[PDB]
Amino acid sequence: SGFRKMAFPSGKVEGCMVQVTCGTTTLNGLWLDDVVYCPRHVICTSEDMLNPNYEDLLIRKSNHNFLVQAGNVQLRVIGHSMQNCVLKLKVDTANPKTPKYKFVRIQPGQTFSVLACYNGSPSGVYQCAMRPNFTIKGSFLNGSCGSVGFNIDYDCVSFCYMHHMELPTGVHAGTDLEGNFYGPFVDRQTAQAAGTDTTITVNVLAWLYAAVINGDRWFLNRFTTTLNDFNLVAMKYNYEPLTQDHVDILGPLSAQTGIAVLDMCASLKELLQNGMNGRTILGSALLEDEFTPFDVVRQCSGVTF
């Protein structure tokens, strides 16, 4: 028993982190087979970053403009190209620690583990979710660009996030590993801002199920509701609409606990309307929305990799 914010074991990813230097800029890269992936803004000076022409800045660059360091070994760069906002550096050595992997683009509301790195060296691991406004509430300092986010299925690492920038509210934006940004953001020093965010309803319901499984039942009541009525409450409180697909996904937890989703929705409706009355749920005074239904089942069942 117990319930904790839990990350995937990070070993398979640690063995892929390297340091990439171009001029005076050092950041992190991801070394898979004979290619290193990193943010393309590594090629920019501060001057360039105000209005970069990435097409022109890269053609100016050649293989010898890049230094790649794997622990204490220099990797020789033998080719370079760009895919969207990701720079790809071909190196002369395949990473012998390359795991089975895929590049996957995730949806808002989905969670992943982040391996925060500095100068190519892993520093910490934490769990976070892609927010509805396509930012992540990370923990990142200068030099963290190129840190990655991932999930694991058995032996296969699914890379879903590469870190590029911090927004003025202190939240973070990045790309998938094909270099496509999450959210309406660009890799240039210009006025940018997180949009207003919403709460991930299906995840809050999943966490309420986790609380019931762990013995926290005070918020349960005799009432049920409908999707239409509940979604009018959700809109009022800036919660994401609940769809029939969300209800289906929660089906397992509904069967295990005896609380139909619309039964639990009736609890959540009451918690939104009335508050928590000084009580906590799984040790939180807020309604937690960065556990997916899968995360709850995994943690309540002990799935291993």
Added chain:
Amino acid sequence: SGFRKMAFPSGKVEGCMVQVTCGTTTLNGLWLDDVVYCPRHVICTSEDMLNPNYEDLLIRKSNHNFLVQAGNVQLRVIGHSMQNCVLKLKVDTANPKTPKYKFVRIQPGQTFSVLACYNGSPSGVYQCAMRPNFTIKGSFLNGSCGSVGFNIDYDCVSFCYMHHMELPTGVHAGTDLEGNFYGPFVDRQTAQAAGTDTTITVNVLAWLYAAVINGDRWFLNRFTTTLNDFNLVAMKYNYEPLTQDHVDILGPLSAQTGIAVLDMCASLKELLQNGMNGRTILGSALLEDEFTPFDVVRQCSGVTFQ
């Protein structure tokens, strides 16, 4: 910016996890050099749960009564010995993935990363603290015994916890890697229960300093406090006493932010009195106590957002 429960990268520990089987019982072991460490209760049967004599149970075992599996490889046990509540199995192969490591016994309030494992396979990593009542509030299912807690400051793995059992309230008890339990717990099915827990005051203060470093000051006030008056108030909310050692430990964070330690104590007294009036601190609506002063310095910028 940001502030997260942040674990250490777990790879160096993943390479040490193995499965140990004795009879019908399977749990996790830690393979370092040519020794596998695991809870000695792996040798207990169903009728041994209440009053096992581990000396008598162990003398009946041969080396080949222990099955150790490292991924797909069976390791051969060539000796065994018991140290306090840990079993040490000598195997015929040194672990080629053994990191630089040490064993350390921690004090209440200290934090560490936990690599939760089942059948020798890692499942997840999270951060924990040793509570003042010598329990940890973990996430552990059946078969998690032998999972370990650790820190990795400066490329050396300091192992500080091995998981042994769950108490009635759902919190967890275990040993250091010399097999000495944290707290008064014993490896017996006994009516044993965690004591009343308390809040780790020095950690709450560290986390308030983290909030100031990351740019928030709304909870400060114009007052100060003596150390004794602070403790007299805080203990009425079931907070641990703050010692001069704790005041000294907070010096560097006090220096980085310009907020005297006893002035931050005055802020905490007022937060206990008032609540947060609908606000949050670093994303939380409660006062967080599982970040140490060292943890805050590890994770936060060395430059305050003034």
